[PDB]
Amino acid sequence: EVQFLRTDDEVVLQCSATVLKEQLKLCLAAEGFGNRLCFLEPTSNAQNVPPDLAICCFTLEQSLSVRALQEMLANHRTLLYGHAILLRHAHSRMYLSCLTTSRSMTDKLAFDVGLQEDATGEACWWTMHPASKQRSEGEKVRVGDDLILVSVSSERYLHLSTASGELQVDASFMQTLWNMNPICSCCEEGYVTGGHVLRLFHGHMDECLTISAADSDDQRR
């Protein structure tokens, strides 16, 4: 029974950084509307500060071999190392992509990583590779596994940039290990699950928990 990532599951991409000799786990995040570009939201503190997971969450729409991807572009499955994956933002219905635009003066070759409206094109697709020697291509991806993600379009790695004082996400020839952590796999009908927006109704739907409307005196507290 070793949990295997499967399509239609929802995942968060985590990376680990050492700052002040203290490990920090950071999740890939994108607002989508307003700001396409991705950033990193720390999750280590968690208890002292809740992170914004909703934007961080992604879902695995497809996993494909390179040849199948080529044929498709010309025109529940377990993930395998060496396959190409398509990732949809849960909030914005957008696709993770390697943008042409670059903001990093530190690395001239690097490209920014951000959301894309349409699944069309190579940019949205990424290929998984084992971070460690024992893992080999064609093996089922396992939860907790460290992964290396390479863009089909740019042949660059999804990378964590620490050159600037601020931590940043970029596509670069340098590689960063990423962990795909599941949030949900399959939900039974009904059967409330965490992380979903809902309403709380005191009784038989007459009244619900709520806060004061805008510009109220209570400051909506």
Partner: peptide, 19 residues
């Protein structure tokens, strides 16, 4: 592909960071 995998071949120039 090989050269991008090993960018040292490009040179200390074209390094990327600090290049």
């Amino acid at each position: 592909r090989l050269l991008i995998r090993k960018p040292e071949c490009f040179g200390p120039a074209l390094r990327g960071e600090g290049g």
